[PDB]
């Protein structure tokens, strides 16, 4: 139980990678508050995976596009569990579209969720975080390698976290809070399954030859959130099966 | 004991970070052979083997790997932790010091990696110990040292491609001191814990990466 007595906030905790993060932090002893945008049923199943196993949890409905909601969610978490130790920023939106074709609404929604809300959550959490804390953003390997058309805005939204992480590491380093940017490759989820021709084409670009697993992303996040990782800060850390080699 | 039954080779395992890596991998259950700088020492019924070998000597390194495999079978893990740091300006650095940094920091990393790869189980792990000076060189005097460490970035990428069909991962751990965002130097045990994580069964999807553990020196 390396996270015994710690409090974690996960932005986007109800499915895929986020659900795996919430469960793994809880299994290591953390109390976890998480946000979900869409489904109360799904957030219930996540909340039950934590509690049936003995862990403590709070599920908060919050739209990562609304400033006010994330700020509110952070405060509600703090009321419930006390000051934060760990923040994991896992909201994410993907729309494909060429430079000449992408709709401005889609651009706006990727900026709101993938960029703006990462900062806003980070700011509120930092205001309510213990010294010695951990802030982990979930970015993408597309910040480093964009091998196909249609991902310009997505990749922009993710390479944004590189500079955010560096400057936040400077800001919060005097409080011994680390800040890191986890950059996954393709991961097998319901909306991006390891199946079909698209998947095959992505696997071909990867050194390993399979999609990553939610639990593997979770493992790394939990290592970074833990007591051995206090010297890792400012870093963009790829976990992408060699996609970006 | 997530490394129970696994075998590790650590090039440069006798003090500081190397010693911490040896100790951590052994504590997780691995058999560990390491080099330090033919002569070897071990304990009856123990699973740690210390082998005297200069990292500039190609035959001694190849032999050391082969000795490890004789004791313990195919490797699962290699950690390349040898390293020399000589300061000198571009105009002044002695060519023998250039040669020593290339031999130890660069050439012996490939030599050990090649020999390990020939005797390594699929599903294995290769971890190079590089430096954050590959990304940020804030003062004069470190050009050859920085060069020797940024070399490991292209090596890591290309070896990851070579070995990925055998599910062997290859990564480059980049420490900073053991300019700082966090206000302290790193502890050898911290570097070791990151190596141990990458060496273990949860890290099979991490490959080709240069992973900084530097207190934000390079931010």
Automatic annotation (TrEMBL), chain A:
Gene3D superfamilies per UniProt: NAD(P)-binding Rossmann-like Domain
GO terms, molecular function: nucleotide binding; oxidoreductase activity
Keywords associated with the record: Nucleotide-binding, Oxidoreductase
Cross-referenced SUPFAM superfamilies: NAD(P)-binding Rossmann-fold domains
Domain of life of the native organism: Bacteria
Binding locations of NADP(+): 12, 15, 17, 37-38, 63-65, 91-92, 154, 158, 187
UniProt family annotation: Belongs to the short-chain dehydrogenases/reductases (SDR) family.
UniProt name for this protein: Short-chain dehydrogenase
From TrEMBL, chain B:
Keywords noted in UniProt: Nucleotide-binding, Oxidoreductase
Chain sites annotated for binding NADP(+): 12, 15, 17, 37, 54-56, 82-83, 145, 149, 178
GO molecular function ontology, one term from the record: nucleotide binding
Keyword Oxidoreductase included in the entry's annotation: yes
Pfam family of the protein (one): adh_short_C2
SUPFAM superfamilies tied to this protein: NAD(P)-binding Rossmann-fold domains
Family annotation (InterPro entries): NAD(P)-bd_dom_sf, SDR_fam
Protein family membership: Belongs to the short-chain dehydrogenases/reductases (SDR) family.
Protein name: Short-chain dehydrogenase
